[PDB]
Amino acid sequence: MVRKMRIAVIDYDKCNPDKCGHFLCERVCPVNRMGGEAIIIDEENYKPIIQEASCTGCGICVHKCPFNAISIVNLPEQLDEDCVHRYGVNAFVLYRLPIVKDGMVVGIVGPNGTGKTTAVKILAGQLIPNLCEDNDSWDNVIRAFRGNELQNYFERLKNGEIRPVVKPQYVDLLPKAVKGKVRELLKKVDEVGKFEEVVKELELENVLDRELHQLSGGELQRVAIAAALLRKAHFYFFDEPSSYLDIRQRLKVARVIRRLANEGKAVLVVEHDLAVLDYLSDVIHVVYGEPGVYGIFSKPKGTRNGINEFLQGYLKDENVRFRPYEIRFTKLSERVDVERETLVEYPRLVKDYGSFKLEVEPGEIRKGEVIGIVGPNGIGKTTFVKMLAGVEEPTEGKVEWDLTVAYKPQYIKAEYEGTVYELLSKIDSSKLNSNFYKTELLKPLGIIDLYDRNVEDLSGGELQRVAIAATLLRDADIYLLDEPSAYLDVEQRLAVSRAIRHLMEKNEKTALVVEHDVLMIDYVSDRLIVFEGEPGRHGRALPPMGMREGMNRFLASVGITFRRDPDSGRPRANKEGSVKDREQKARGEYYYA
Numbered sequence: 001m002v003r004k005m006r007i008a009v010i011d012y013d014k015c016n017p018d019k020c021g022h023f024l025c026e027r028v029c030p031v032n033r034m035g036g037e038a039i040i041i042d043e044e045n046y047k048p049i050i051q052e053a054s055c056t057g058c059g060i061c062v063h064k065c066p067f068n069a070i071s072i073v074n075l076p077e078q079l080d081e082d083c084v085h086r087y088g089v090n091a092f093v094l095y096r097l098p099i100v101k102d103g104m105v106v107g108i109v110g111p112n113g114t115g116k117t118t119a120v121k122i123l124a125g126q127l128i129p130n131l132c133e134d135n136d137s138w139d140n141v142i143r144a145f146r147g148n149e150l151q152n153y154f155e156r157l158k159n160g161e162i163r164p165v166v167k168p169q170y171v172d173l174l175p176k177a178v179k180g181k182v183r184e185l186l187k188k189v190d191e192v193g194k195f196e197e198v199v200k201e202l203e204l205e206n207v208l209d210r211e212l213h214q215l216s217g218g219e220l221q222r223v224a225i226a227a228a229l230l231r232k233a234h235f236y237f238f239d240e241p242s243s244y245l246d247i248r249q250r251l252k253v254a255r256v257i258r259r260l261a262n263e264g265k266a267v268l269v270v271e272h273d274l275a276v277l278d279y280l281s282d283v284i285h286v287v288y289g290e291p292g293v294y295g296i297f298s299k300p301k302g303t304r305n306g307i308n309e310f311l312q313g314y315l316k317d318e319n320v321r322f323r324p325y326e327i328r329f330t331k332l333s334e335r336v337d338v339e340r341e342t343l344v345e346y347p348r349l350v351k352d353y354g355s356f357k358l359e360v361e362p363g364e365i366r367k368g369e370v371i372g373i374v375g376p377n378g379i380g381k382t383t384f385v386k387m388l389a390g391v392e393e394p395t396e397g398k399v400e401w402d403l404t405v406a407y408k409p410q411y412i413k414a415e416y417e418g419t420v421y422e423l424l425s426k427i428d429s430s431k432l433n434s435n436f437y438k439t440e441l442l443k444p445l446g447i448i449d450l451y452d453r454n455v456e457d458l459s460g461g462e463l464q465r466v467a468i469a470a471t472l473l474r475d476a477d478i479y480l481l482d483e484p485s486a487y488l489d490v491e492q493r494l495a496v497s498r499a500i501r502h503l504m505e506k507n508e509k510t511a512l513v514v515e516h517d518v519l520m521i522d523y524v525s526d527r528l529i530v531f532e533g534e535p536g537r538h539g540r541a542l543p544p545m546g547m548r549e550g551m552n553r554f555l556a557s558v559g560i561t562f563r564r565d566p567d568s569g570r571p572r573a574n575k576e577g578s579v580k581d582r583e584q585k586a587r588g589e590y591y592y593a
């Protein structure tokens, strides 16, 4: 059997006809070479256009583009009949839609730029799908979904019977849309009368009297989650609630949100934190395809199965492989019995800012291991790191080591006039040419597609990746990475976990990683360091302990339990009040393996 459509997307924001000669496309294009119209010139808006009706998909134009403003993919005809929406000529297109279920939480996972948020505005009524045509009505939509269980949802959606509530992705815009303090907005938006329950569970008591613009990311995020739970509806759609929330906060909100399913409401959530997704979700959808080009929603899957196939990069039913390599967690019985040596040691430390005090318990750092640091923000994790980096003088104690350090800072504000390739090549040009470094670092994080860009012109997520890659291309005795997962989609977090683990493993080096993402911590860690106390007041970093003893100490502070997926080896979360959640807690066993 066979069947195949060609799909061309050109990121115009990257095209510049005057720099590549005269539309390098039509020139290099074989079809145009033999009097054909694969690539046509829009001599007005001055852009090139690929008439997919021609394009053999040979991909010559793609390789040639001096930047990379062209993508040509060969897909099977069949999806053409499940096309849901396309943003225009050579623009991004989405296939299929996720299913919403009364009384449950349907999770959604996949890399950004594959229509996760596109699916949300559509099911919420904000965007009427154009069926990859010129459609502008709901009736044509209802017809297209005849036979699907969504056909009815949409009939109702058009009638005005149901109207979903939405926690928007971009919370950093809320301030510049509303005015006043937090108490006011939450009063108005309230419709179920629970100003107290909500504001309390989300620990908003303080912020209440402050103003929108005086809020941080975490706070802003939380105020959004809040206004959403205060709404009296039936459909709730949360887009990326994990953002800006620390290890503790993000896990506590899933529990708050998931309870909506209990009240018999239909919940939908997009997530990049697998542990948060697992705990939340009853059903799950994977979205695969190339970012910015096209996206396809898989059939609904059981949280467990769905999440494992995800790690493998192969969706059995759909029968697709969206990632060359898999990502498997090492069982436990697979681990290696090793007596490591001490690399360096640190005495009791104390940093006192006057308004906030941190105390560090004495500890040993071993050569070749990886210690993950976890704890709520405002507790002293970064302060700690800066003392080992030496960029911070202790109030008491003293870290005088004779070692080289590679430090990937938490808040990086790119200020370097140059390109990514310039910056990296100046660190270690040879490694950039290494088949090992290109395979484990450079390609996985996508620093090749970034070489040409200027460091100052990079986005939060890109800058994160380049910093991480910069840090890891250096030769040091110890590596310090302060919160790598920030601004990274699900796929990027995984690539970085595998990278950090592989590179440290290969060159036999030691590293310390602060993280709020449970799966990354579990993946890269050999040991753990937990912080407790009163955020913003005092914090105490415990001594390095085993993973089990560690996760046990931290998790009890949140009230969540984890098992071990027999197959994947990944940490599997227990839903609030499950038989296992009960047994495990009764024995104070929050983490297995």
Ligand SMILES: Nc1ncnc2c1ncn2[C@@H]1O[C@H](COP(=O)(O)OP(=O)(O)O)[C@@H](O)[C@H]1O
Binding pocket: 087, 091, 092, 110, 111, 112, 113, 114, 115, 116, 117, 118, 119, 291, 292, 293
């Ligand atoms: N209004 C728009 N016009 C054109 N392209 C858009 C628009 N909104 C989103 N896109 C493109 O669609 C792709 C997927 O969009 P989005 O739903 O935001 O993705 P995800 O939620 O997976 O990050 C991105 O490449 C994005 O640039």
Ligand SMILES: Nc1ncnc2c1ncn2[C@@H]1O[C@H](COP(=O)(O)OP(=O)(O)O)[C@@H](O)[C@H]1O
Binding pocket: 353, 355, 356, 375, 376, 377, 378, 379, 380, 381, 382, 383, 384, 535, 536, 537
């Ligand atoms: N120079 C300073 N003066 C006063 N307070 C500070 C200073 N630097 C940090 N803090 C406060 O210390 C607390 C913890 O800081 P930090 O170690 O950065 O936390 P985290 O665990 O989020 O990394 C925060 O409440 C922060 O406002």
Ligand code: SF4
Binding pocket: 010, 014, 015, 016, 017, 020, 023, 024, 025, 048, 064, 065, 066, 067, 068, 069, 070
């Ligand atoms: S797509 Fe690439 S090669 Fe073609 S005009 Fe644009 S910049 Fe030039």
Ligand code: SF4
Binding pocket: 028, 029, 030, 031, 032, 038, 039, 050, 054, 055, 056, 057, 058, 059, 060, 061, 062, 072
């Ligand atoms: S992929 Fe090949 S055939 Fe299609 S537009 Fe580019 S060069 Fe022409």
Ligand SMILES: [Mg+2]
Binding pocket: 049, 089
């Ligand atoms: Mg045209």
